[PDB]
Ligand binder design. Structure first.
Ligand SMILES: [Zn+2]
Ligand SMILES: [Zn+2]
Length: 214
């Protein structure tokens, strides 16, 4: 199952793609929001091929168009499919910083429309985007669904099983703890936390990430 979707509730699913790296499958997660006005994804996938497959899958499943994607940072698991999005008229939301870094990391440019705290609404689906500070990357954001207390952590947030922070060349490891604390402060009662990779959990993922960073 290279692309899978898993349900959190009626209109919120996790999408998960196995990228192929050195003969290893590597999952990446994002979210699929089924809204009265189309499907909204949080994050694309590793590359255009997978992004196209993801879009195909979700569109067929829900019989709805993907209209918007929120890009959580300017790396491949997240923004790999930006060309696919642009060539489909799928709006690719991001902070200005993510757009700037995208333009630098060799990618087409997302919208740069998100601020530190931004509210979006897609049909009846409310979405908050939050830049908690630097961590995994300078630009990493998280996404929250206030109606459902579901948090999409991206690569800022590690799964329970993770013992390793990943590539930290471009990480702000010291600042990452504070950014996670900012997320823990902001989001008090959380029903689900989606890590960038790995199993969905709850607030314990945030605490576990903090623990890794200690
Ligand atoms: Zn990354
Ligand atoms: Zn990642």
């Amino acid at each position: 199952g290279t692309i899978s979707i898993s349900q959190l509730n009626k209109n919120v699913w996790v999408h998960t793609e196995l990228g192929s790296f050195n003969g290893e499958a590597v999952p990446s997660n994002g979210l699929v929001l089924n809204t009265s006005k189309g499907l909204v994804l949080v994050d694309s996938s590793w590359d255009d091929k997978l992004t196209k497959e993801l879009i195909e899958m979700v569109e067929k499943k829900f019989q709805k168009r993907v209209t918007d994607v929120i890009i959580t940072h300017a790396h491949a698991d997240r923004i790999g499919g930006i060309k696919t999005l642009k060539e489909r008229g799928i709006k690719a939301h991001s902070t200005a910083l993510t757009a700037e870094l995208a333009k630098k990391n060799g990618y087409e440019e997302p919208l740069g429309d998100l601020q530190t705290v931004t509210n979006l609404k897609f049909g009846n689906m409310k979405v908050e985007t939050f830049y908690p500070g630097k961590g995994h990357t300078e630009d990493n954001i998280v996404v929250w669904l206030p109606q459902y207390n579901i948090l999409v952590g991206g690569d800022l947030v590690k799964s329970t099983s993770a013992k390793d922070l990943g590539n930290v060349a471009d990480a702000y490891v010291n600042e990452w703890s504070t950014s996670i604390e900012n997320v823990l402060k902001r989001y008090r009662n959380i029903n689900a936390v989606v890590p960038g990779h790995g199993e969905v959990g709850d607030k314990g993922l945030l605490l576990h990430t903090l623990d890794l960073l200690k």
